[PDB]
Design a protein around this ligand. Structure first.
Ligand SMILES: COC(=O)Cc1ccc(OC)cc1OC
Ligand SMILES: [Mn+2]
Ligand SMILES: [Mn+2]
Lengths: 137, 137
């Protein structure tokens, strides 16, 4: 039986800017680094950056909607978004759903998100206003 | 600050087979589905499957090392991996370069993994068998 997400690994084209982005800009904790990767944590999340020459710096129009959302409190959301904006981090989508969301790109074009709100909050909102074809289990 | 992974969203090309894979084959909990997506949980993980006409079924030699690992206990690991193998689930990696792991593909080629152990345990193992150039902070 699977008990949760064990780790998220992102392939990166250049290790130093990716470490700078996740540790310094995004505030994650750097636990270890080696010639071809790094381990960081963000709350319970174990993040691995893996240096991969096959990673392309990918424009957002050229990747699908797969994306990785990090939790932040409502109270901290606006100043964190402003930090990303000051750093010139590109946005790939505007928020049109429930709960604050800021959609931003990492240095290689990985699609990231800041989101406020849990699955339970989303399901409650959906029960009141179900999406087209929605069924609950 | 950021406090963990709020959700993982995977773009899928065919919603029903992807729901079946995550719910039936992997045992995740299905909470809701709609014409364009589904919400599942795996322990604390909120997984969203999002129907995306841009998603391509991608062979593993065509994608980078970005991947998603799910936690499983030492007692359950081998039989779950063997069940995936017997069910014909495609693989993408054999060499255990980061501990006890089984590397397998979802229907669209998303790179998945079963892994036994925490970040703390992986750091302890790496102290004895470090990756090249490894530094610990
Ligand atoms: C794995 O169970 C589901 O994915 C639920 C379901 C099954 C079939 C179906 O339409 C044929 C619609 C469904 O939910 C909206
Ligand atoms: Mn999202
Ligand atoms: Mn892994």
């Amino acid at each position: 039986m699977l008990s949760g997400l064990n780790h998220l690994t992102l392939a990166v084209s250049q290790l130093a800017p990716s470490v700078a982005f996740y540790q310094q800009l995004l505030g994650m904790t750097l636990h270890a680094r080696w010639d071809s990767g790094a381990y960081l944590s963000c709350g319970d999340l174990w993040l691995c950056l893996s240096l991969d020459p096959q990673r392309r710096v990918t424009p957002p129009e050229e990747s699908d909607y797969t994306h990785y959302a990090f939790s932040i409190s409502e109270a901290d959301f606006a100043s964190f978004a402003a930090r990303l904006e000051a750093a010139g981090v590109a946005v790939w989508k505007l928020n049109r759903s429930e709960g604050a969301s800021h959609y931003f790109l990492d240095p290689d074009g990985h699609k990231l998100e800041l989101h406020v709100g849990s699955l339970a909050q989303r399901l409650a909102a959906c029960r009141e206003q179900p999406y087209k074809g929605m069924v609950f289990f």
